[PDB]
Amino acid sequence: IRGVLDRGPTFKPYSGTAYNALAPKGAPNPCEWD
Amino acid sequence: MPTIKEGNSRELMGQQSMPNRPNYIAFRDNFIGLMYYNSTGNMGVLAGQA
Amino acid sequence: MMPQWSYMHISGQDASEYLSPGLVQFARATETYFSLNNKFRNPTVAPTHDVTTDRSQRLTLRFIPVDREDTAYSYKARFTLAVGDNRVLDMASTYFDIRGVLDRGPTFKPYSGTAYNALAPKGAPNPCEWDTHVFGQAPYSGINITKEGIQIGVEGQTPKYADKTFQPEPQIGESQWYETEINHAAGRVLKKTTPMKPCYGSYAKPTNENGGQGILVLESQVEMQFFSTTELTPKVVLYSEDVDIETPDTHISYMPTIKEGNSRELMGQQSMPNRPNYIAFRDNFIGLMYYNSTGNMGVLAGQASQLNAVVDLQDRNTELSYQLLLDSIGDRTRYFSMWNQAVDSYDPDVRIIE
Amino acid sequence: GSIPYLDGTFYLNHTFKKVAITFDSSVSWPGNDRLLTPNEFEIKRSVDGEGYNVAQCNMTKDWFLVQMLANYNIGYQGFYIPESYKDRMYSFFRNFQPMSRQVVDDTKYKDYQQVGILHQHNNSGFVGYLAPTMREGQAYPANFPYPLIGKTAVDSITQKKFLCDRTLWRIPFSSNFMSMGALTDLGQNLLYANSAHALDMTFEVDPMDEPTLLYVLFEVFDVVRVHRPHRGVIETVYLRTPFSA
Amino acid sequence: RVGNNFAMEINLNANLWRNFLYSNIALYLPDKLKYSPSNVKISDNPNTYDYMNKRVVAPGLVDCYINLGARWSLDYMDNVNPFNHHRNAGLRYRSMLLGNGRYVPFHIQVPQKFFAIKNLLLLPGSYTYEWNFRKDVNMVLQSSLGNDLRVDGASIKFDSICLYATFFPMAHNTASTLEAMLRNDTNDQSFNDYLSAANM
Amino acid sequence: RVGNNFAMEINLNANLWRNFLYSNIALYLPDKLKYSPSNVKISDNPNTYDYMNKRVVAPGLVDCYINLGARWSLDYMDNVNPFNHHRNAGLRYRSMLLGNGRYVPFHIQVPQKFFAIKNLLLLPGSYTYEWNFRKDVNMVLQSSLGNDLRVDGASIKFDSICLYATFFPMAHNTASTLEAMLRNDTNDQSFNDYLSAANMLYPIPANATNVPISIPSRNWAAFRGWAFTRLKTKETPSLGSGYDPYYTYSGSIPYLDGTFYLNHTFKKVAITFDSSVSWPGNDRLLTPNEFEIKRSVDGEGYNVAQCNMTKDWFLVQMLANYNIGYQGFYIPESYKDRMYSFFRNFQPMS
Amino acid sequence: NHGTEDELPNYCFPLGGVINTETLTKVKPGWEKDAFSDKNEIRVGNNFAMEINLNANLWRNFLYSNIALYLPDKLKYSPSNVKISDNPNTYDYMNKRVVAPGLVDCYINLGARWSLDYMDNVNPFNHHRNAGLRYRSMLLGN
Amino acid sequence: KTAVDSITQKKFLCDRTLWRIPFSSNFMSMGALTDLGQNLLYANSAHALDMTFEVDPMDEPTLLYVLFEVFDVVRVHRPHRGVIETVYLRTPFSA
């Protein structure tokens, strides 16, 4: 059988994050506000 | 989430991030469920054409 | 019955009997490169006579001691093992069922480390006081501070103050990471009458359903202590108290002074977890029963014979013999709780350092 | 998620209490005063009957014996670990996990105080409060949990239980519970061949706060004989007994 | 510098133990022990991933001092399906067998399991072989969290299906003789289902 | 912020390695390498837990740079009982089988191990079955530290003891017939102890190097051979007497459980019959007059397997355990190389 | 790469539990001073803490040590201001050539079971985790 | 490059096992009742035995545990109901 599958947006094959994993979980990005 | 209020403020600098829960999705062991079995409404067929 | 069973091969002959001789010959000759065996059923039928009894009969019998003698260092139990007529007993299916009470004592510690404040630096002290100086922390940020203590809110238009017995709670503090500058802070501290001990390993039983540990005498003895900056409303409020402080699984790894009593010196003492110490019955209950000891020899005799079939020598080693026997007839790495069958071993990486 | 019914990921076997089997609403099976508690199969007992348990958990001697015999024919000549090739992945022993622990006796320990997560503090000042968030609080002696060891160990009570996942409970229709052939001895008893019988079963289980299902497998013979008399012709005869279609 | 250097302390082993407990047991605890997060939008459907991902659970429920010194499964988890977990090696492997992405063009081989024909030796002739396949993602797909994939956007489409058969290149005189023998009723084939049971 | 952020550095992997070394090896080092803590009260009894728990040992004795790049057991630990350790999985499991608490109401099943009756098929009749059980905590209980449980408050009480027996529900005509057959002496049952040996213990004084033993003239027909090890007196309770007053140890008991660990301390063995005839003699071994177990540098030539064991001894042990030796040396088949076998436990080091 | 279980944050704290204490004076009730020393160290707020992702670090160190450094030489580059051998078959050369951690970082092919295309054709046995070779090496000594 | 002058040390460990010296002419196992065990030399007359073990010194009291491998057998007779008679024989080293 050949077909196409979309596991959807809830598919996450791993623990943790792929972005800035070493950054303290509360540290913000350089930002600005009023 | 420090404040419910929308928009960037000094308050939002104290928000914390957490990784989403892992969630593996795949076909089942031995492709269980793909084929119909034990269901009279969708019974398989193997018969001599003769 | 019979008809359908034979035809569907639920009973009857084996494939080697019901198949034609030609096919049977062919199957054997091709077995190695093309197998037909899994295509024909071979029935298995259990015998229907001369195996089990039709009569009423217990599978397991339980015997009570006819005589027992609990002595200084040993226990003796006598039973009348009765094997009924038309029955046989394989001794391997017998065993002594024992119920009692065990106290492993105070040196039993089934784990490494501590159960209390394991994340606290091993030298960090608990908020304390001595002679009078105070070393503490005020993590709770309240609305205002009056002679009533720290204000945790306002029920209607009236001010609601913290309940001395458990508030503020050491567990609570500011939520954001940046300093927002707290003007009315509160915290808990230990009176100088409570001995100083490192935070790590520190324990004190709670005296109220809300988690407070203040000692009762029966009323609470908590005493508020207000502090202001050296420069006149108080900025901090500390709820000092005495707690039944104990360190059940750790010991001091560094004693600064031999002198008794709380002092600034004791703030430099360090705590270390007690060594783990597992205590249990031995592998295969070795040692529980007497063997190879003429003074406490076992007994198995016909009441009609009176002669003891058991004859032991202190020259024999029954326990070891059984250890080696098991190794020869099975996988000694597997555990079986019934016989306390879990062999003694060690970590290979500990015995030989790589 | 996994579907135990189809894939075998069973995990609720520990919630069964006892099973009573009755033929023709009066005859108890196996009867014959075979089991320690003759009128039913008691899977586990709660303290009151410790004496009849084994393997250092809440399972009964009766049930341990039946399961060992049913799976490996082990029981009448001693209990021992079954051979690996017979103790497969979905077998009884391989998945049998007896367990014990102690906990404060809330009715005999004088200083007992019931404290919930809301008010327990251990590592206060170094951990977040009721969440996996930033540390907060202040250092302070922990007030939880109670010491179960040491000189000031608290009055305790013992709890025993067991787990037995990915396996099926078994009660073979065999006079001695042993496997002596696919077609059992009782299965060919004239008593069960010459006449029809009605069956009653009563299962007692641990309550669960959600809808569950009792999955019963009535072991039978599910056979087929295939005939191919001529080219392109396949004729089959299906027979399932007992419980014919 | 006069004196010892500046140092910060941390209990490595205690942390690692704790992270293991929270990740593998805490988060899988029954929903009744959890609570909704404040100031954060959370789905109303408890079968949703969003719901199972945002419900917060306190670390103190399964902290490093939980039942210290014991070999004990939490009473709360005894009745929780142990296989719906991210440490289910089998599921994890089948997941990675497809890839690490959401969009996947698959190609698989599916076996016949029906006992009456799975090991049958079929003789010469033409046969109609027909079967039905499911498209319901909650049946053909599996997740470690077990959320409702019908609601959570999982999707599947079957482009083509073929039937493959391999034949021993048997000598024709031998095949012919074997065929003659297997066509007599005395040599009829027979099979029984392994489970052999009526399921109620 | 101008520049990089504020950071602190730590070597994670080095720390974890170090903690492992200190916890599992350092703390278990011999007491002579330790020292008492200052300003802290410590017990006078070295068999005490308090003593073994407060004696301090320097991390630098087994630090992460210890014998770097080598597979080597510390010479200090070679003669230390390896089973009295918190990583002894078997002991740990039996400990958790009872619970995680100090106070434990137990319920256990104890097997009969005496060879003469353990597998006996008992016929109809009434028999008196009586046995004795020990109450000495140093014998019935086991600790990983091996401290004196008599002094350290361990306690045990036996409330009730029952005897259970299971009977195959054999057909009465069959049981009756089997009974008749088994009552004839021609069909008498017979068993032999698996170990099949007379056990002797000879004292080896501290620092003693030579151990001579002598068996007065006797009959040797049917003699099967010799087997031997070395035990520590402190770890071997005095048996025969119902209670050993000087037994202040609760660790593994090699003599009874098989946790032998001093086989590496044997140098050589000389066997002599009638004070003149050397056995096996016949110029069989490379060093014909004795069994040399190991050699020290001076005789490297006669060693093998890349360690100090001799070719002679390696050959004898391989033959004795697996009959391997006259037609090449190779790893024995797994089913013959059990847990208490020679090869499985042979660990050469350099 | 099934990621890292870093749900809970990891911190290190001051040796004394707290470090940014402020000097305060005891007070009694308006309020009047007290004399208790007039110099007491009390920290207001949470303690000083530093954060680190333990699990992510360990994963990363594993990747760099076992895969990164064994990557083909074409993906590496010579270090600046450091003397390095001309012979590529040299240990000095294989030891000083520098490789960027970002080539095999903890987010590499996340959620997949995949061998790097660069390493498929690299002899997998010439590695420090070759147990057989390691054992024969220690059999001779250290 | 600056490795220090070294010396090599070799040793071995062999836990949870027993050293063995079988009373067999070729040290091999050819049956429970060995060939030397049935040699007339050891059957027709009595002999005295001397053994000398040399061991590494230990700074504490130890014990040499010697197992003299023999036959430790029992024959059980049950002539009548409730009667058990046994015959024990251990050779060599009879009780």
JSON list of C-alpha atoms in Angstrom, two decimals, chain F residues 244-332:
[
{"chain": "F", "resi": 244, "resn": "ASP", "atom": "CA", "xyz": [27.60, -17.99, 68.33]},
{"chain": "F", "resi": 245, "resn": "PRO", "atom": "CA", "xyz": [28.28, -15.31, 71.00]},
{"chain": "F", "resi": 246, "resn": "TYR", "atom": "CA", "xyz": [31.22, -13.78, 69.10]},
{"chain": "F", "resi": 247, "resn": "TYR", "atom": "CA", "xyz": [29.37, -13.32, 65.78]},
{"chain": "F", "resi": 248, "resn": "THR", "atom": "CA", "xyz": [29.10, -9.55, 65.32]},
{"chain": "F", "resi": 249, "resn": "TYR", "atom": "CA", "xyz": [28.58, -9.43, 61.56]},
{"chain": "F", "resi": 250, "resn": "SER", "atom": "CA", "xyz": [25.53, -9.41, 59.27]},
{"chain": "F", "resi": 251, "resn": "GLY", "atom": "CA", "xyz": [26.84, -9.29, 55.70]},
{"chain": "F", "resi": 252, "resn": "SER", "atom": "CA", "xyz": [27.00, -12.11, 53.16]},
{"chain": "F", "resi": 253, "resn": "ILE", "atom": "CA", "xyz": [28.29, -15.43, 54.47]},
{"chain": "F", "resi": 254, "resn": "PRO", "atom": "CA", "xyz": [30.38, -16.98, 51.64]},
{"chain": "F", "resi": 255, "resn": "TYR", "atom": "CA", "xyz": [30.46, -20.33, 53.44]},
{"chain": "F", "resi": 256, "resn": "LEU", "atom": "CA", "xyz": [26.67, -20.64, 53.17]},
{"chain": "F", "resi": 257, "resn": "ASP", "atom": "CA", "xyz": [25.64, -18.47, 50.21]},
{"chain": "F", "resi": 258, "resn": "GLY", "atom": "CA", "xyz": [28.52, -18.86, 47.75]},
{"chain": "F", "resi": 259, "resn": "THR", "atom": "CA", "xyz": [29.63, -15.23, 47.65]},
{"chain": "F", "resi": 260, "resn": "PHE", "atom": "CA", "xyz": [33.28, -16.31, 47.49]},
{"chain": "F", "resi": 261, "resn": "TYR", "atom": "CA", "xyz": [35.78, -13.58, 46.62]},
{"chain": "F", "resi": 262, "resn": "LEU", "atom": "CA", "xyz": [39.25, -14.52, 47.88]},
{"chain": "F", "resi": 263, "resn": "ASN", "atom": "CA", "xyz": [40.29, -17.11, 45.30]},
{"chain": "F", "resi": 264, "resn": "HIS", "atom": "CA", "xyz": [42.99, -14.75, 44.00]},
{"chain": "F", "resi": 265, "resn": "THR", "atom": "CA", "xyz": [45.01, -15.06, 47.22]},
{"chain": "F", "resi": 266, "resn": "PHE", "atom": "CA", "xyz": [46.16, -18.65, 46.65]},
{"chain": "F", "resi": 267, "resn": "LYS", "atom": "CA", "xyz": [49.77, -19.18, 45.59]},
{"chain": "F", "resi": 268, "resn": "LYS", "atom": "CA", "xyz": [50.27, -22.94, 45.26]},
{"chain": "F", "resi": 269, "resn": "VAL", "atom": "CA", "xyz": [49.08, -26.33, 46.53]},
{"chain": "F", "resi": 270, "resn": "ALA", "atom": "CA", "xyz": [51.17, -29.44, 47.20]},
{"chain": "F", "resi": 271, "resn": "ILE", "atom": "CA", "xyz": [49.45, -32.80, 47.60]},
{"chain": "F", "resi": 272, "resn": "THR", "atom": "CA", "xyz": [51.19, -35.79, 49.15]},
{"chain": "F", "resi": 273, "resn": "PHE", "atom": "CA", "xyz": [50.05, -39.33, 49.93]},
{"chain": "F", "resi": 274, "resn": "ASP", "atom": "CA", "xyz": [51.80, -41.36, 52.65]},
{"chain": "F", "resi": 275, "resn": "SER", "atom": "CA", "xyz": [54.28, -38.54, 53.22]},
{"chain": "F", "resi": 276, "resn": "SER", "atom": "CA", "xyz": [56.45, -39.32, 50.19]},
{"chain": "F", "resi": 277, "resn": "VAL", "atom": "CA", "xyz": [54.34, -39.94, 47.09]},
{"chain": "F", "resi": 278, "resn": "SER", "atom": "CA", "xyz": [53.53, -36.73, 45.25]},
{"chain": "F", "resi": 279, "resn": "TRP", "atom": "CA", "xyz": [50.19, -36.51, 43.45]},
{"chain": "F", "resi": 280, "resn": "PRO", "atom": "CA", "xyz": [49.50, -36.42, 40.62]},
{"chain": "F", "resi": 281, "resn": "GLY", "atom": "CA", "xyz": [53.23, -36.86, 40.15]},
{"chain": "F", "resi": 282, "resn": "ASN", "atom": "CA", "xyz": [54.23, -38.68, 36.95]},
{"chain": "F", "resi": 283, "resn": "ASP", "atom": "CA", "xyz": [55.90, -35.51, 35.69]},
{"chain": "F", "resi": 284, "resn": "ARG", "atom": "CA", "xyz": [52.53, -34.27, 34.41]},
{"chain": "F", "resi": 285, "resn": "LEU", "atom": "CA", "xyz": [52.70, -30.54, 35.23]},
{"chain": "F", "resi": 286, "resn": "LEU", "atom": "CA", "xyz": [55.31, -27.99, 34.09]},
{"chain": "F", "resi": 287, "resn": "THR", "atom": "CA", "xyz": [56.26, -27.75, 37.78]},
{"chain": "F", "resi": 288, "resn": "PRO", "atom": "CA", "xyz": [55.62, -31.48, 38.57]},
{"chain": "F", "resi": 289, "resn": "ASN", "atom": "CA", "xyz": [55.79, -31.39, 42.37]},
{"chain": "F", "resi": 290, "resn": "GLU", "atom": "CA", "xyz": [52.93, -28.99, 43.03]},
{"chain": "F", "resi": 291, "resn": "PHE", "atom": "CA", "xyz": [50.03, -27.00, 41.67]},
{"chain": "F", "resi": 292, "resn": "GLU", "atom": "CA", "xyz": [51.22, -23.44, 41.13]},
{"chain": "F", "resi": 293, "resn": "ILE", "atom": "CA", "xyz": [48.18, -21.19, 40.89]},
{"chain": "F", "resi": 294, "resn": "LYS", "atom": "CA", "xyz": [50.05, -17.97, 40.08]},
{"chain": "F", "resi": 295, "resn": "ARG", "atom": "CA", "xyz": [53.61, -16.68, 39.60]},
{"chain": "F", "resi": 296, "resn": "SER", "atom": "CA", "xyz": [55.30, -13.35, 40.34]},
{"chain": "F", "resi": 297, "resn": "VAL", "atom": "CA", "xyz": [57.28, -11.86, 37.40]},
{"chain": "F", "resi": 298, "resn": "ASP", "atom": "CA", "xyz": [60.30, -14.13, 37.98]},
{"chain": "F", "resi": 299, "resn": "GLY", "atom": "CA", "xyz": [58.40, -16.83, 36.12]},
{"chain": "F", "resi": 300, "resn": "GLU", "atom": "CA", "xyz": [56.39, -14.87, 33.56]},
{"chain": "F", "resi": 301, "resn": "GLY", "atom": "CA", "xyz": [57.20, -17.50, 30.93]},
{"chain": "F", "resi": 302, "resn": "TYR", "atom": "CA", "xyz": [54.88, -20.00, 32.58]},
{"chain": "F", "resi": 303, "resn": "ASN", "atom": "CA", "xyz": [51.86, -17.69, 32.81]},
{"chain": "F", "resi": 304, "resn": "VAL", "atom": "CA", "xyz": [48.98, -17.22, 30.33]},
{"chain": "F", "resi": 305, "resn": "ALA", "atom": "CA", "xyz": [45.82, -15.34, 29.41]},
{"chain": "F", "resi": 306, "resn": "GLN", "atom": "CA", "xyz": [47.72, -12.09, 29.94]},
{"chain": "F", "resi": 307, "resn": "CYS", "atom": "CA", "xyz": [47.73, -12.22, 33.75]},
{"chain": "F", "resi": 308, "resn": "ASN", "atom": "CA", "xyz": [49.70, -13.88, 36.56]},
{"chain": "F", "resi": 309, "resn": "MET", "atom": "CA", "xyz": [47.93, -17.25, 36.32]},
{"chain": "F", "resi": 310, "resn": "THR", "atom": "CA", "xyz": [50.06, -20.23, 35.27]},
{"chain": "F", "resi": 311, "resn": "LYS", "atom": "CA", "xyz": [49.52, -22.37, 32.18]},
{"chain": "F", "resi": 312, "resn": "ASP", "atom": "CA", "xyz": [49.28, -25.43, 34.47]},
{"chain": "F", "resi": 313, "resn": "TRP", "atom": "CA", "xyz": [46.49, -24.00, 36.60]},
{"chain": "F", "resi": 314, "resn": "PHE", "atom": "CA", "xyz": [44.54, -22.54, 33.68]},
{"chain": "F", "resi": 315, "resn": "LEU", "atom": "CA", "xyz": [44.65, -25.96, 32.03]},
{"chain": "F", "resi": 316, "resn": "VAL", "atom": "CA", "xyz": [43.48, -27.84, 35.11]},
{"chain": "F", "resi": 317, "resn": "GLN", "atom": "CA", "xyz": [40.60, -25.46, 35.82]},
{"chain": "F", "resi": 318, "resn": "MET", "atom": "CA", "xyz": [39.41, -25.52, 32.20]},
{"chain": "F", "resi": 319, "resn": "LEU", "atom": "CA", "xyz": [39.47, -29.33, 32.14]},
{"chain": "F", "resi": 320, "resn": "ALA", "atom": "CA", "xyz": [37.88, -29.70, 35.56]},
{"chain": "F", "resi": 321, "resn": "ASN", "atom": "CA", "xyz": [35.03, -27.32, 34.65]},
{"chain": "F", "resi": 322, "resn": "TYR", "atom": "CA", "xyz": [34.42, -28.08, 30.98]},
{"chain": "F", "resi": 323, "resn": "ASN", "atom": "CA", "xyz": [36.81, -30.83, 29.88]},
{"chain": "F", "resi": 324, "resn": "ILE", "atom": "CA", "xyz": [38.46, -28.21, 27.68]},
{"chain": "F", "resi": 325, "resn": "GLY", "atom": "CA", "xyz": [42.23, -28.30, 27.29]},
{"chain": "F", "resi": 326, "resn": "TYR", "atom": "CA", "xyz": [43.64, -31.22, 25.31]},
{"chain": "F", "resi": 327, "resn": "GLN", "atom": "CA", "xyz": [42.16, -30.10, 22.00]},
{"chain": "F", "resi": 328, "resn": "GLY", "atom": "CA", "xyz": [42.48, -26.34, 22.17]},
{"chain": "F", "resi": 329, "resn": "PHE", "atom": "CA", "xyz": [41.33, -23.52, 24.42]},
{"chain": "F", "resi": 330, "resn": "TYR", "atom": "CA", "xyz": [38.10, -21.69, 23.62]},
{"chain": "F", "resi": 331, "resn": "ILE", "atom": "CA", "xyz": [35.16, -20.07, 25.37]},
{"chain": "F", "resi": 332, "resn": "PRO", "atom": "CA", "xyz": [32.93, -22.80, 26.85]}
]
